[PDB]
Amino acid sequence: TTAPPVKESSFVEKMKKTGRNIIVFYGSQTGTAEEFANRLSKDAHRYGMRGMSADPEEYDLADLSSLPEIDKSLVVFCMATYEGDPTDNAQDFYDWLQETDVDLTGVKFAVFGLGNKTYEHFNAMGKYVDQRLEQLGAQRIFELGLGDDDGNLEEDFITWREQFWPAVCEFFGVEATSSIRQYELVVHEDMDVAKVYTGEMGRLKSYENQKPPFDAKNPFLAAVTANRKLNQGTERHLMHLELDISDSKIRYESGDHVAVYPANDSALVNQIGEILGADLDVIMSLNNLDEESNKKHPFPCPTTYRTALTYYLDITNPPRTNVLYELAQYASEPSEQEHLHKMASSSGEGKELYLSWVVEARRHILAILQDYPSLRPPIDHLCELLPRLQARYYSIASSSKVHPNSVHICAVAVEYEAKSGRVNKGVATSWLRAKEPAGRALVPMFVRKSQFRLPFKSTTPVIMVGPGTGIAPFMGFIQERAWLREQGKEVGETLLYYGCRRSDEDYLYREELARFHKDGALTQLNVAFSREQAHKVYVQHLLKRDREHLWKLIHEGGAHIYVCGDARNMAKDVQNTFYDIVAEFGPMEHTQAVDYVKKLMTKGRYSLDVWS
Ligand SMILES: Cc1cc2nc3c(=O)[nH]c(=O)nc-3n(C[C@H](O)[C@H](O)[C@H](O)COP(=O)(O)OP(=O)(O)OC[C@H]3O[C@@H](n4cnc5c(N)ncnc54)[C@H](O)[C@@H]3O)c2cc1C
Ligand SMILES: Cc1cc2nc3c(=O)[nH]c(=O)nc-3n(C[C@H](O)[C@H](O)[C@H](O)COP(=O)(O)O)c2cc1C
Ligand SMILES: Nc1ncnc2c1ncn2[C@@H]1O[C@H](CO)[C@@H](O)[C@H]1OP(=O)(O)O
Numbered sequence: 001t002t003a004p005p006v007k008e009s010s011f012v013e014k015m016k017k018t019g020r021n022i023i024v025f026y027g028s029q030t031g032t033a034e035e036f037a038n039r040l041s042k043d044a045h046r047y048g049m050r051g052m053s054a055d056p057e058e059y060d061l062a063d064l065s066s067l068p069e070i071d072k073s074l075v076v077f078c079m080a081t082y083e084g085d086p087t088d089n090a091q092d093f094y095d096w097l098q099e100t101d102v103d104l105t106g107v108k109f110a111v112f113g114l115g116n117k118t119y120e121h122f123n124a125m126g127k128y129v130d131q132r133l134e135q136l137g138a139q140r141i142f143e144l145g146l147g148d149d150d151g152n153l154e155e156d157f158i159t160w161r162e163q164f165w166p167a168v169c170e171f172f173g174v175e176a177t178s179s180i181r182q183y184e185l186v187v188h189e190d191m192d193v194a195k196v197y198t199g200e201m202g203r204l205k206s207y208e209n210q211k212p213p214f215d216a217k218n219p220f221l222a223a224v225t226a227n228r229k230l231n232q233g234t235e236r237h238l239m240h241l242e243l244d245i246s247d248s249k250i251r252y253e254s255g256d257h258v259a260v261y262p263a264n265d266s267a268l269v270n271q272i273g274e275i276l277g278a279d280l281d282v283i284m285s286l287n288n289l290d291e292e293s294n295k296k297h298p299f300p301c302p303t304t305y306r307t308a309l310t311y312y313l314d315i316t317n318p319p320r321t322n323v324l325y326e327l328a329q330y331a332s333e334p335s336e337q338e339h340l341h342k343m344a345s346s347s348g349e350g351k352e353l354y355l356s357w358v359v360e361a362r363r364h365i366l367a368i369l370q371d372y373p374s375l376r377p378p379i380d381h382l383c384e385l386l387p388r389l390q391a392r393y394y395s396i397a398s399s400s401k402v403h404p405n406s407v408h409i410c411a412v413a414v415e416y417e418a419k420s421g422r423v424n425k426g427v428a429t430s431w432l433r434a435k436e437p438a439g440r441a442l443v444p445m446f447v448r449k450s451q452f453r454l455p456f457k458s459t460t461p462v463i464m465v466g467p468g469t470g471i472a473p474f475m476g477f478i479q480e481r482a483w484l485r486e487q488g489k490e491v492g493e494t495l496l497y498y499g500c501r502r503s504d505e506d507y508l509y510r511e512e513l514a515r516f517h518k519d520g521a522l523t524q525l526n527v528a529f530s531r532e533q534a535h536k537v538y539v540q541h542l543l544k545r546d547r548e549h550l551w552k553l554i555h556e557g558g559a560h561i562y563v564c565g566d567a568r569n570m571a572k573d574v575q576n577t578f579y580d581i582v583a584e585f586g587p588m589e590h591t592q593a594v595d596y597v598k599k600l601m602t603k604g605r606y607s608l609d610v611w612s
Pocket of ligand 1: 257316362392393394395396410411412414416425426427428429430469472610611612
């Protein structure tokens with residue numbers, strides 16, 4: 001559930017007033033689709049047209065029926081998919097699409113879906129919108145784009161976009177017409193301190209003066225009460241943090257996710273300013289040159305560049321091609337300007353260089369500024385080009401039944417040697433690792449309700465599979481199932497299938513799990529130590545070992561299956577093992593076993609909390 005915002009007045013009438021003929025809506029949750037929509041809206045101008053981006057949530061898409069009132073009009077949808085559903089901001093549009101009977105005759109559209117092939121329902125939202133608009137009477141002007149974040153989404157967009165525009169120009173009889181700034185810089189001298197943002201996300205001083213309810217736009221600064229290392233070795237750093245949410249009025253259940261707004265590495269920020277020869281402490285504002293847009297700034301303003309680079313901008317992920325394309329003008333060495341220019345190529349050496357030199361090598365903006373030393377853009381323009389710093393999600397590792405005023409986190413710190421030649425540090429995990437309990441160590445956060453939940457009936461059996469940090473939500477599940485037993489409730493079997501390299505090196509929550517097992521909260525504690533023998537022993541091997549009993553729990557006990565952790569290979573391997581279990585004991589042919597397992601998913605008996 002989520003209260004709906006007050007809609008803006010019809011977007012078509014706004015297009016008429018502003019001379020726009022193309023509008024690109026974005027269904028986005030991590031800002032990717034938003035960037036893609038903005039890029040397409042900007043492209044229009046280079047083809048003799050004029051566009052605008054827009055959040056579908058702020059509008060009534062029913063006005064699409066009025067779009068034909070504008071000559072040679074066109075609407076484009078850049079939609080990402082999440083858990084097989086629309087992004088939060090596109091749920092309204094989705095619901096309307098299903099219930100409406102409105103006739104969209106005359107409407108011209110195009111859709112670029114953002115997805116990831118490793119998920120069950122790949123690009124489910126983009127596919128639905130593309131098909132539904134046509135059923136409603138609209139006509140497709142260009143083929144559905146299927147972006148796959150498992151390969152390279154940026155390239156899928158480049159390829160689609162390169163074909164899209166010629167198609168649009170050809171159909172509407174328009175033609176291809178210099179760098180253009182979206183914002184203008186306004187430096188502020190003598191400005192009061194009370195009016196300068198310092199990292200807050202919503203209203204000025206919202207971090208200092210905390211007022212509920214707390215959410216993505218108004219995060220609660222939670223005190224880190226505990227932050228300890230969970231593993232023994234020095235190979236990696238796995239940690240457990242406990243955030244105090246007392247007096248926040250925030251509610252949560254095991255299975256939910258906790259999001260945090262981190263701060264970038266200050267040395268990284270410092271170095272960017274230094275290499276550009278810029279004063280990061282200048283207070284300024286970037287104001288939209290289009291006084292009509294509601295998006296007055298790229299991020300909270302006024303503020304210093306240092307604050308923007310630290311809290312509002314992404315300065316670690318590989319820059320996307322349009323950014324490097326716009327920065328090329330600032331490279332005084334011809335050969336460097338040429339490389340940056342060609343990064344936007346849909347094929348050839350330009351594309352190959354971008355994929356290996358920028359993406360594979362994981363070069364962040366500073367690395368590029370260092371490796372292409374002639375590249376010296378003005379700081380204000382770079383800040384306008386960089387993407388927004390996103391919050392990071394973690395599977396809450398505690399049960400609100402046991403810890404109603406504390407939200408636990410289990411994570412592995414990200415730190416690796418990149419082919420770019422430097423050690424790359426994970427933004428959120430490096431920041432979290434540094435938070436020391438007791439001044440207060442505060443973490444801006446909020447909770448996102450998920451559908452990953454323990455069975456309603458205490459008696460229903462639970463099968464938990466979560467190797468490595470995948471154990472996170474299960475520490476919450478187990479705490480809760482233990483609590484239910486302590487409260488006199490009858491609890492069905494609770495089985496954990498966990499995995500790590502070695503018992504004495506990275507066996508997370510070893511002591512806590514042993515106790516739950518001893519007390520009976522855990523009916524079985526099955527642990528696969530992948531490196532204690534020559535052969536790899538994984539959780540799926542244990543599931544295969546216990547195939548007969550698991551089938552009993554699944555077929556006779558109505559047991560619920562839960563998988564958390566690596567979605568790339570572990571999740572699939574585990575799924576395939578369940579297919580094999582069902583096939584042997586049904587019995588039934590593979591094809592039928594697959595349908596059976598996918599059916600458990602729809603019936604809410606096989607849930608996933610997987611990530612990359
Ligand atoms: C719903 C959901 C639940 C999650 N739950 C948890 C959880 O409970 N515990 C947990 O630990 N994580 C979990 N995560 C992952 C978490 O959100 C972050 O992505 C993770 O903590 C890293 O964030 P960061 O800011 O530290 O690193 P970032 O700065 O975001 O960097 C991450 C990127 O670094 C790159 N990278 C990482 N290692 C390498 C490498 N070795 N070589 C090349 N590239 C690499 C990859 O592109 C990776 O995407 C979850 C993610 C989702 C979506
Ligand atoms: C928790 C999570 C769940 C996802 N579920 C799906 C999914 O079901 N189907 C799909 O095609 N892509 C899925 N994706 C991939 C996103 O759709 C893809 O990364 C998209 O580029 C994100 O766009 P955004 O930044 O505009 O929200 C998922 C990503 C995350 C992080
Ligand atoms: N494909 C897979 N299926 C199940 N577990 C896997 C897996 N790949 C790696 N693991 C194991 O997941 C645990 C947490 O990372 C480790 O024991 C790791 O073992 P490995 O690293 O020795 O391969």
